[PDB]
Write an enzyme that holds these catalytic residues in place. Structure first.
Site, PDB file in Angstrom:
ATOM      1  N   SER A 184       0.787  -1.243   0.000  1.00 57.31           N
ATOM      2  CA  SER A 184       0.000   0.000   0.000  1.00 57.31           C
ATOM      3  C   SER A 184       0.817   1.290   0.000  1.00 57.31           C
ATOM      4  CB  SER A 184      -1.004   0.025   1.159  1.00 57.31           C
ATOM      5  OG  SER A 184      -0.355   0.093   2.415  1.00 57.31           O
ATOM      6  N   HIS A 212      -6.221  -4.478  -0.902  1.00 53.38           N
ATOM      7  CA  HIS A 212      -6.061  -3.356  -1.828  1.00 53.38           C
ATOM      8  C   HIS A 212      -6.264  -3.762  -3.289  1.00 53.38           C
ATOM      9  CE1 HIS A 212      -5.136   0.003   0.788  1.00 53.38           C
ATOM     10  NE2 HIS A 212      -4.454  -0.828   1.557  1.00 53.38           N
ATOM     11  N   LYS A 243     -12.426  -1.056   2.488  1.00 53.01           N
ATOM     12  CA  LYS A 243     -11.854  -0.480   1.279  1.00 53.01           C
ATOM     13  C   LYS A 243     -12.888  -0.628   0.174  1.00 53.01           C
ATOM     14  CE  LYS A 243      -7.461  -0.891   3.490  1.00 53.01           C
ATOM     15  NZ  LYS A 243      -6.475  -1.886   3.986  1.00 53.01           N
TER      16      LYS A 243
HETATM   17  C1  LIG Z   1      -6.562  -2.082   5.307  1.00 49.50           C
HETATM   18  C2  LIG Z   1      -5.703  -3.232   5.776  1.00 49.50           C
HETATM   19  C3  LIG Z   1      -5.876  -3.730   7.075  1.00 49.50           C
HETATM   20  C4  LIG Z   1      -6.863  -3.146   8.033  1.00 49.50           C
HETATM   21  O1  LIG Z   1      -8.243  -3.223   7.696  1.00 49.50           O
HETATM   22  P1  LIG Z   1      -9.378  -2.471   8.562  1.00 49.50           P
HETATM   23  O2  LIG Z   1     -10.595  -3.239   8.189  1.00 49.50           O
HETATM   24  O3  LIG Z   1      -9.435  -1.061   8.122  1.00 49.50           O
HETATM   25  O4  LIG Z   1      -9.016  -2.644  10.000  1.00 49.50           O
HETATM   26  C5  LIG Z   1      -5.107  -4.798   7.536  1.00 49.50           C
HETATM   27  N1  LIG Z   1      -4.154  -5.364   6.714  1.00 49.50           N
HETATM   28  C6  LIG Z   1      -3.958  -4.885   5.442  1.00 49.50           C
HETATM   29  C7  LIG Z   1      -2.900  -5.517   4.580  1.00 49.50           C
HETATM   30  C8  LIG Z   1      -4.712  -3.821   4.959  1.00 49.50           C
HETATM   31  O5  LIG Z   1      -4.502  -3.419   3.802  1.00 49.50           O
END
Ligand SMILES: *Cc1c(COP(=O)(O)O)cnc(C)c1O
Ligand SMILES: *Cc1c(COP(=O)(O)O)cnc(C)c1O
Lengths: 397, 397
Positions: A184, A212, A243
């Protein structure tokens, strides 16, 4: 007292604010008109710093499902999934994930952070190994910290170091290799095909995070692993509802026959309330639409390519040579340059995600742009013109 | 492989199911008509195993706020509170908590579990101490595990052991004493007045969890600490949105001048998306109504006293001599007796929360009843008649 340890951080913050820059950690979206438009400090602003990749938060079916669930089931469950908190829509959202990923198993958590925390700490015990990229998400490291396994970091993005480190471990104990499909910070992609081959050579189980990539990589939108031909080879896929899906929640899916037994032992699953009916209802609807949201996928990638190509050609240093994800990271020379760019963009009507140390490694200073399926071509060109103006004024290009 | 460690739990589950009992960890609320009524296995059922203490999940103002937020702001934020995820309603919910507790500081987390995990692990560092009851909530222990502090367990509910253990610690290092106002297993109350006096004698800061008291203890509904005269003496109060408030979320409030700097360093705050607009909107509305929900408070306590008194008089062994909270725990002699009672109640149209080892200590087998402000007197008497019938059939009374 216990808060004296924060004196340094407090002084650092005040130093930043002494420059006259808007507090980047206190931005408020006073109004949000759509996935791509907000009002910030009373100013109409294009959003280019969200993970609403597929624009699902304003999808009319998604919104209607949430309203209906509020009406029919109330605002919350007031109980855990192990007790009174599993309503109709919780069963629906787990089934939606099974259908989305083509798996027999699906366990939903209250956040992605908690899904990672729980699954890592529960799957790997004393005498076992968790093997992870040095720059893994905080929640993956926190999962390691929560559990009793041996932790094996490998050099960021290094198939070779993964192979060498795995090869030195004892053969018999069970092992979990944890990988992310999209990195990310810079928006580059992991070499999953090669890394999973290495994991399997050493007899390790594999967990891949596809947070992502959901809805826009692979024929079914399952993620980088699907795009790279690894269907049926990944033991566990972890993800989020925050997301592409457009709400909150976490999950893990798997075809392992004993998988849903994880529910019996997983502390972050057991010791928290289940998600509100409206949250699991909006997630169900969104997930199911994301299985076949081809028009949106096409727009998302078109927008990403236009932004990535435009910023690169204008003279900005990008985190990636080619447009490999929906994140485009602009790299600046120092903290001041990043802050001045970010402020100029904000004042001109554009929000992007600034990232500076310690969010980034020392010496890395970023403007992280993220694209939405619902950005219009006019918006993307407006953004490019804004970057041109800001870059010229600040002296970056 | 990694799941072989669950073979014992899987066999234990199958043994339980061999008795013909409904799987207690897979109950589904197919429909939920109100805070007190559901449909389970196609049967109309009274709910007496939820933490919807004040019935807020079906409050019309709460529901309307959630629907309006979905319409106006969408289904989710798609960003963290440190970036793009702080909308109007996030600022509103933090202010609602400030007003509710009379504090200058309020930090909201995505769950109560995460609030405890984060605040404990962030406030107390290396060379410092976290002092906690032996039977503290899992999230409090997980916070300890996540941090680098020295952990000091004291004997459950023992003012004396708290005092003695604290007294043996070095004087200079900062210390956090973590207490819960209501002990959820049996529904008894902590001696906070005495324990906080001990904490202050030893110069410790105090964190109190008021999750099981919110809206119905103390003149302002702030919790056991308020009821026991400790206003202005508690450094941090932690709580949840998933019980009285009726959604999901966690929080910590404080008057400490450096408190909101915790946001800069707290991993479970930073590395997760903010809550959906509808969640923080319903929470804001609910919290504000809970400041003055006197009619509901009166009904809740009336119902609790009627249930507690009725079950005790009928011959059930209760976890408490007097009605001290909205949880009434019936204690059985063995696992079979608890399961038979629970099944008879379920089949007769009543859901309560069964608790057996390892949820409870070895030798403790419970039916945990929890009361709602919106239970009617007729429902409470229906429940008592159901317990009478089940108790007689199973041979408990
Ligand atoms: C966004 C993300 C998280 C966290 O997700 P939330 O639901 O916002 O707590 C954890 N690990 C990875 C790799 C992420 O991209
Ligand atoms: C309910 C509770 C929690 C967990 O809250 P969630 O918001 O459901 O995660 C944590 N600690 C205590 C003491 C609780 O009572």
């Amino acid at each position: 007292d216990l808060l004296s340890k924060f004196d340094g951080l407090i002084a650092e913050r005040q130093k930043l604010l002494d420059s006259g820059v808007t507090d980047p950690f206190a931005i408020v979206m006073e109004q949000v008109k759509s996935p791509t438009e907000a009002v910030i400090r009373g100013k109409d602003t294009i959003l280019l710093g969200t993970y609403n990749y597929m624009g699902m938060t304003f999808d009319p079916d998604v919104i209607a499902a949430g309203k209906e669930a509020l009406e029919k089931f109330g605002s919350g469950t007031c109980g855990s999934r192990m007790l009174n908190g599993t309503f109709h829509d919780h069963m629906e959202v787990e089934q939606a994930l099974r259908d989305f990923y083509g798996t027999t198993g699906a366990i939903v958590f209250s956040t992605g952070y908690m899904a990672n925390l729980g699954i890592i700490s529960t799957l790997a015990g004393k005498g076992e190994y968790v093997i992870l990229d040095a720059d893994s998400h905080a929640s993956i490291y926190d999962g390691c910290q929560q559990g009793n396994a041996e932790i094996v970091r490998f050099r960021h993005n290094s198939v070779e170091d993964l192979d060498k480190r795995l090869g030195r471990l004892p053969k018999e104990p069970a092992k979990l290799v944890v990988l992310e499909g999209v990195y990310s910070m810079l928006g580059d992609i992991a070499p999953l095909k090669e890394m999973v081959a290495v994991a399997k050579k050493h007899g390790a189980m594999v967990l891949v995070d596809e947070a992502h990539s959901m809805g826009f990589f692979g024929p079914n939108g399952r993620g980088v692993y699907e795009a790279q031909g690894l269907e049926g080879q990944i033991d566990f896929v972890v993800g989020t509802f925050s997301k592409s899906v457009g709400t909150v929640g976490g999950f893990v899916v798997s075809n392992h026959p004993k998988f849903e037994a994880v529910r019996l032992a997983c502390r972050p699953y057991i010791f928290t309330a289940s998600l509100p009916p409206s949250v699991v209802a909006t997630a169900t609807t969104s997930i199911r639409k994301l299985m076949t949201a081809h028009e949106k996928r096409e727009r998302l990638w078109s927008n990403a390519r236009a932004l990535h190509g435009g910023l690169k050609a204008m003279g900005f240093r990008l985190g990636t040579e080619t447009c490999d994800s929906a994140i485009v990271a602009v790299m600046l020379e120092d903290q001041e340059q990043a802050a001045m760019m970010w402020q100029a963009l904000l004042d001109g009507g554009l929000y992007v995600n600034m990232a500076r140390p310690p969010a980034t490694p020392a010496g890395t200073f970023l403007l992280r742009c993220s694209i939405c399926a619902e950005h219009t071509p006019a918006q993307i060109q407006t953004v490019l013109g804004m970057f041109q103006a800001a870059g010229r004024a600040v002296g970056v290009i």
